[PDB]
Nucleic acid binder design. Structure first.
Ligand SMILES: C[As](C)(=O)[O-]
Ligand SMILES: [Zn+2]
Length: 180
DNA sequence: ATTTTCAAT
């Protein structure tokens, strides 16, 4: 039902903080939802969380999906909520995966942009977009959704941090400059 | 609690 382990609240709060230059976030958290659509069956859903170490989270996701999930005559609507955006090696692997598997649709929401000022990382993001992945920055609604779905929230509402929206606005500006 | 995004020389 749930792939991997949900986060405790302080881990989520730490890891999904969206200050563009945060220090000390060495992990990439990769939360996902997936709609599994097969013609003569009811639609089904899967959700979970991947972390680093097929080493990086993005590659762990691809390897699990191929080994456990991918089936003929099935369409997949996949959404990632990542704490960091991908490195160029991961981006290239995800892009080639998407080229190889036309029945997979990927939407990526990211809290932060990893090395957004580096051209190699910019190209990685571009190549993802060019293979049909939608790349977006997480806003309030996406943080709220992750809190509700991937965190042991103990029925407590999401508490947005100061600067959340301003950070979103800065990061989205950078993303659109990259994707342009 | 007017229940933590925004409230800004
Ligand atoms: C965001 As990464 C370093 O796991 O590709
Ligand atoms: Zn990577």
């Amino acid at each position: 039902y749930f792939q991997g382990s949900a986060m405790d609240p302080p881990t989520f709060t730490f890891n999904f903080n969206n200050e563009p230059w945060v220090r000390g976030r060495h992990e990439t958290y990769l939360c996902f939802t997936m709609e599994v659509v097969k013609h003569h069956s009811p639609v089904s859903w899967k959700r979970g969380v991947f972390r680093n170490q097929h080493c990086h989270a993005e590659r762990c996701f691809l390897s699990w999906f191929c080994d456990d999930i991918l089936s003929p005559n099935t369409n997949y609507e996949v959404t990632w909520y990542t704490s960091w955006s991908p490195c160029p090696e991961c981006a290239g692997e995800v892009a080639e995966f998407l080229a190889r598997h036309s029945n997979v649709n990927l939407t990526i929401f990211t809290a932060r942009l990893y090395y957004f000022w580096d051209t190699d990382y910019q190209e990685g993001l571009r190549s993802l977009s060019q293979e049909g992945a939608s790349v977006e920055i997480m806003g309030y609604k996406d943080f709220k959704y992750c809190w509700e779905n991937f965190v042991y929230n103990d029925d407590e509402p999401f508490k947005p941090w100061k600067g959340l929206k301003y950070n979103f606005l800065f990061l989205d500006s950078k993303l659109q400059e990259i994707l342009e």
